[PDB]
Design a protein around this ligand. Structure first.
Ligand SMILES: O=C(NC1CC1)C(=O)N[C@@H]1O[C@H](CO)[C@@H](O)[C@H](O)[C@H]1O
Ligand SMILES: O=C(NC1CC1)C(=O)N[C@@H]1O[C@H](CO)[C@@H](O)[C@H](O)[C@H]1O
Ligand SMILES: *Cc1c(COP(=O)(O)O)cnc(C)c1O
Ligand SMILES: *Cc1c(COP(=O)(O)O)cnc(C)c1O
Lengths: 810, 810
């Protein structure tokens, strides 16, 4: 059908069709008379999978031959989403499969909707890992993603009575055609036990063993025939485990629970033992694999030349003391040598500055679960503080501030401090975030070792986030500048010479309208809810959290509603406000915000006077697959976190690449986005980081805004009186109380400017031509936000490897 | 190589080789440089599996078209063993695969040893189900085996310090290439809840739901292109199950534990709740499947004409009240009509008369777990006893004896009584066993409904138990009478005309010697233990139980040892005594017997004076795959259970078919075997059932034998003094005490005759020619014991269907 989807050759379409029928018969054991759509999806998946194996085997053989430096990306989350379409895109098989299935009397788009998302992540952090794997494969790096194969990923969200209900994400129910179990590479992981100090070295004994079984998933690069590996570990009990008889066998579950479920927290630390086990489990199994592969290439001096370990936040921080343990206790290297190797091998990426999100494990937990690691951590702390003491003689407070060990009620280990001390590089994920790290939370560390601190602004893959989810836009763009931009996004700048092109302006606007129509139809199909495709699509999709301020969005929505009720026959640009995102199960305030959103919709959506001028919809079960649908359909992207709280944000980049304008604060990557497109082409509002600090120094008093802003006062009074909860008048008492007395994110402080800015948005939307021209200026300057750029920087500035766009023989 | 293994055609060997390489590449994702023997086994398994699918799909399509009466064999055990070789044999692919793998530089026998046994059974009962599935497919019956897919089958037995150690049988670790998950046919099963009596009918509400996910395994008939299905259910928790968040997800294990492990008891009832759940789980899911299939063919009058349900013992007895529940509560049929249909549909097979093995569930368990079923059972009991009262007016004791409800300490439900009342046919598994059922335990029922009682002597499949495990013997036999006997075992009688044939006598003896050499080599390979291939192989393999009397065998062994020590330079026929079998984990006496066996070996095997004249080896981890190795190598088969305790036995038949002579009591099928071959060609000894009864009436006093038999006295004194346990003098105090004071199986009573009989065995072994001629007379008359004969009788006399030897188009 369209160019960017590849060729539908005669031979290939014929070949695909026969292999499809082969798998349906031999693999699924079915016939066209009893096969269901799910059967067809699997037949198609196995057919596409076959095309991956050849490349997968030779890519790995290639790395064995050339023995390049290996990159190991350790993460407890990989938010992959669906794999079928992405694989077809990267292998240039989309049109061929489209034609082949068409000839078989099947609609491929229908089959793609059957695949379950691999939701092994919570949000931004997990999605970043997924985009990174795609980019590393596309740039020809010998990279491996290592994590845990959770039996249950992020929970599926159901909305009942306006409340969030959680249900298990049994994503493996029907099987996973993409993974390949590798039981032959099963490795043992140790827990508990005690440390024994003998003549030569310490020994960790009397441990409980849990086996780590790996499952490999192929990661195809974009049309370069490279196929890397994502290896996820699954917990298995040894067969002699606990070996009445029946009970012993049933208790195997205790050990296998390690890989059972993903902790559903976004930017929040929960110090649970099971989570610590998951963290050590992935680290212990991964490091043995890394060392095994390294020896199969004694000379650990070259270890840093052949290995790079990237820690995605502090979750896998135990890799530092585990590497020391192996080198010192097992390989018998002297401490100093082992430390040198460890530091040169490890690099750490920080993803947040919120205090409640930092990992600080109670010493008593480490003491019982990983006694040898605790000892190693104390030794690391001791030698590190000696270095600090020598650099800043007499500065006793600095010593207590920089210690890896925190004193107080319960002693804790600051994992972020552990990571900085044991890594040769520490980076933030957006320029403003990296600067904040050096000026505030890690200031002491920056003064001691300035060279370690870097910035690596996040990015998103243009394959999944443009070509895959928005073929219409990818097509009109290719028509003008070719297809080279898909793997070199900076080329989009060439579109700047079309900002005055009447044909292009028309096509861009047409693509957006078609996406909105397609999405508006979807909302009625799977969720039965009518919306006006001619209205401005105002959307805020991301995890629910106070710092992201979905509440500020809510205040604007109610303001719009009250203004209409006040002057009904006055014209206002029609809007469809869409808010979606999951709340962590134990995050009460977040769950109350979801309820507030649906409650607002319950009133606004049924008010005769409002008509189709304003609609408030809460997008249920926001996940990667839904993001691929709603982002291409958006007109306005809400990125309104309080300045200084959103480390980077990545959803913001997805919206910019897909033709939506942005209303946001100068926070995270929003700053660089506005800088790239020009502030005149961005809707910036609110306090800057400096303004927030001034307010804190003076003392934030929400009452002041309530007293001086009549419209704000009205909203709070409506909330308090039960206007949005007739049957339960005080239902939102907690929300009002927080807003009025202990709002850490200063919602009221940005209210006036936000509402004012929103008026400017509506004004521009009334002029289709100028709205679209500004959109082109955004799309054209979004090149910097490709994860290919991000990965190229990690490769050159941290890992010490050169990216390559060279194709491998297929 | 040999005839019976099929043709190794040019085209097929070429085709096999290419598909082997295809699977190794695409399916296993490997190359010849990194592939291990396990990888090769799987590539071969998938290649053979492909040949099954075509036939599997058309067989099932065939049944849908012709809509024949369906046979449902319900069992909680299916002791399948390995599947690769069996599939090749039944598809006539053995020589072709042998050649194809040979050309690829691989030894197929080596690859076959890699497959894990599907050990979803304990012993005879489970193996019978497996042989039956093979025969039903070979006789063209539209049959389905229904059971549970245990994650862990019978435990693997390790011997440590002469003691049995159990370890989990993680048979699914590397995957199961034979099964096909069918998540689309998942069905709900209910537990707990309460009964609500409304206007029209009762309702079972407030139940906890567990999902039953089926896994289908193909069952190929012998060269007739028929491929039936064995459907095993796996327990899955619903996604809204228990829906802190993490705990709720982790507790899903509670529900999924239902299909976690096989209860390891052989002829012993353990009233545990989890076992009851397993029993209802298989019954509930299976019946919905049966009814679904029946409706997809309202008129339940024809239900018995299209459905036959065979209950393998009482384990699935809940099928009776569950069928009533569905017909009455859900389909709204009147009780009388529903009962008529139920009785005509169900048939019950009893497998033992030992009191401790009968299922008698506490009413309080059924009351809580299956409240509606308890009510239905009481109603059944009420109507049944009214029938008894009308047939035997005034016989109040008969009423209490025949009740399904047993009174006493705790009220219990006798499941055997439930089965007889609700089945149109009840059968024993050997003539003597079926007679005992009518004369003793079920005498009252027989007098009420004589027509229900039948006999169906057990059998074994000649495919697995001759062709597969003993190709050498199958070959020399085919050379004389052709291959027709493999599916018509009665033809072996033609071998009687070769009993005087010098060439045949030589070949038979040669095959046995080769098997013994092959086994003697295996013992050194995997277990490092030297044995003399020229000695008589005396073997007793079967589960360890007091009624099977491995202890009587032990007494003879020690007698042989003491006789040698007494007259060292006297000649005695060399023997290798082999005993193997697992003991239930909680069966203390059984575990002590295993220890005694190894203790005897510890003394006998290292006594210089004995030399290679006597060896006692305990065969570790006896299972189907080991049976296929040791049975063809045996000279003497020990079937010495106390008369009246072994319902049938099937191991006895395997030995007879493979060239071993039998020493045994007139118990179970031994009686019919001796009758078929002629008592002169069998080594019968001991009390008959009548003799045992006389002894009980008089009172069994072991002391009497101890006082009158000097050799027996010596053995008991050696045991009591610690002769076989120097470091632990009283180690066997429990054994001696039981033998002397409370031996329910009268070991001493048969000692003299047993030892005398054993002398006659040794005398015949000294004359190779006459020993072999008697062997031929046994092999030649073993035809009656083919499970094809057994199944043909079930088909005609119970299920009402005609067996067919007609091939289906491949
Ligand atoms: O869960 C997260 N962080 C702490 C729990 C470790 C997490 O997802 N942080 C997220 O990481 C993304 C990619 O770097 C950024 O775009 C987001 O701003 C940040 O919140
Ligand atoms: O476990 C068993 N029986 C009771 C526990 C139900 C069982 O395996 N019984 C066995 O069934 C075999 C086949 O019919 C017979 O050959 C054996 O004699 C009988 O013990
Ligand atoms: C991109 C993405 C995110 C991150 O969104 P932000 O607005 O940066 O927090 C979260 N969830 C999903 C499903 C995403 O695709
Ligand atoms: C045949 C068989 C049995 C039954 O043996 P009996 O001696 O009849 O009890 C038990 N276990 C295995 C593995 C078998 O093959």
């Amino acid at each position: 059908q369209i160019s960017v989807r590849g060729l539908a050759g005669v031979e290939n379409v014929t070949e695909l069709k026969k292999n499809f029928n082969r798998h349906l018969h031999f693999t699924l054991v079915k016939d066209r008379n009893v096969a269901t759509p799910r059967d067809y999806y699997f037949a198609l998946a196995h057919t596409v999978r076959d095309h991956l194996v050849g490349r997968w085997i030779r890519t790995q053989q290639h790395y064995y031959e050339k023995d390049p430096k290996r990159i190991y990306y350790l993460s407890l989350e990989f938010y992959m989403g669906r794999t079928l379409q992405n694989t077809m895109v990267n292998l240039a098989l989309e049109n061929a499969c489209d034609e082949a299935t068409y000839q078989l009397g099947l609609d491929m788009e229908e089959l793609e909707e059957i695949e379950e998302d691999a939701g092994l992540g919570n949000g931004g952090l997990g999605r970043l890992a997924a985009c990174f794997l795609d980019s590393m494969a596309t740039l020809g790096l010998a990279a491996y993603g290592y994590g845990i194969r959770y039996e249950f990923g992020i929970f599926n969200q159901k909305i009942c009575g306006g409340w969030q209900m959680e249900e298990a994400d049994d994503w493996l129910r029907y099987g996973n055609p993409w993974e390949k179990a590798r039981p032959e590479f099963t490795l043992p992981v140790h827990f508990y036990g005690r440390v024994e100090h003998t003549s030569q070295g310490a020994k960790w004994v009397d441990t409980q063993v849990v086996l780590a079984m790996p499952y490999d998933t192929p990661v195809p690069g974009y049309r370069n025939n490279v196929v890397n590996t994502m290896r996820l570990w699954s917990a298995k009990a040894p067969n002699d485990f606990n070996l009445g008889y029946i009970q012993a066998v049933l208790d195997r579950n205790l050990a296998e629970n390690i890989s059972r479920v993903l902790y559903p927290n976004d930017n929040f630390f929960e110090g649970k033992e099971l989570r610590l086990k998951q963290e050590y489990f992935v680290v212990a199994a991964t490091l043995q694999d890394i060392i095994r592969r390294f020896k199969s290439s004694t000379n650990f001096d070259a270890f840093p030349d052949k290995v790079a370990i990237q820690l995605n936040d502090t979750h896998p921080s135990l890799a530092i003391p585990e590497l020391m343990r192996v080198l010192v206790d097992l390989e018998r290297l002297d401490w100093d040598k082992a430390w040198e190797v460890t530091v040169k091998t490890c690099a750490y990426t920080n993803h947040t500055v919120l205090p409640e999100a930092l990992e600080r494990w109670p010493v008593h937990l480490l003491e019982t679960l990983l006694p040898r690691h605790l000892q190693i951590i104390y030794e690391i702390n001791q030698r590190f503080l000696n270095r600090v003491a020598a650099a800043f003689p007499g500065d006793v407070d600095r010593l207590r501030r920089m210690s890896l060990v925190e004193e107080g009620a319960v002693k804790r280990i600051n994992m972020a401090h552990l990571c900085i001390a044991g890594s040769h590089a520490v980076n933030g994920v957006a320029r403003i975030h990296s600067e904040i790290l050096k000026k505030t939370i890690f200031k002491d560390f920056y003064e001691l070792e300035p060279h370690k601190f870097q910035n690596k602004t996040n990015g998103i893959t243009p394959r999944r986030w443009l070509v895959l989810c928005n073929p219409g836009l990818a097509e009109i763009i290719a028509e003008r500048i070719g297809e080279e931009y898909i793997s070199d996004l900076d080329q989009l700048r060439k579109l700047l010479s079309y900002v005055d092109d009447e044909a292009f302006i028309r096509d861009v606007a047409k693509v957006k309208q078609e996406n909105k129509l397609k999405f508006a139809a979807y909302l009625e199909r799977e969720y039965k809810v009518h919306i006006n495709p001619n209205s401005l699509f105002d959307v805020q999709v991301k995890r629910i959290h106070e710092y992201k301020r979905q509440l500020l969005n809510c205040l604007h929505v109610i303001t719009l509603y009250n203004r209409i009720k006040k002057e009904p026959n006055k014209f206002v640009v029609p809007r469809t406000v869409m808010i979606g995102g999951k709340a962590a199960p134990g995050y009460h305030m977040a769950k109350m915000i979801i309820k507030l959103i649906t409650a607002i919709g319950d009133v606004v959506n049924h008010d005769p006077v409002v008509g189709d001028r304003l609609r408030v919809i809460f997008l249920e079960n926001y996940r990667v697959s839904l993001a691929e649908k709603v982002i291409p359909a958006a007109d306005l992207s809400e990125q309104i976190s309080t300045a200084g709280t959103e480390a980077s944000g990545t959803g913001n980049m997805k919206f910019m690449l897909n033709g939506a304008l942005t209303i946001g604060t100068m926070d995270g990557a929003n700053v660089e986005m506005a800088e790239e497109a020009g502030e005149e082409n961005f809707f910036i509002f609110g306090m800057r980081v400096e303004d927030v600090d001034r307010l804190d120094q003076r003392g934030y008093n929400a009452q002041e805004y309530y007293d001086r802003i009549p419209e704000l006062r009205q909203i709070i009074e409506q909330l308090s009186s039960g206007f949005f909860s007739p049957k339960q008048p005080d239902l939102f008492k907690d929300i009002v109380n927080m807003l009025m007395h202990h709002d850490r994110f200063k919602v009221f402080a940005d209210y006036e400017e936000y509402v004012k800015c929103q008026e400017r948005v509506s004004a521009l939307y009334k002029n289709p031509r100028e709205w679209t021209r500004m959109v082109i200026r955004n799309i054209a300057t979004s090149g910097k936000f490709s994860s290919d750029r991000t990965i190229a920087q990690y490769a050159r500035e941290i890992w010490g490897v050169e990216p390559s766009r060279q194709r491998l023989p297929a």
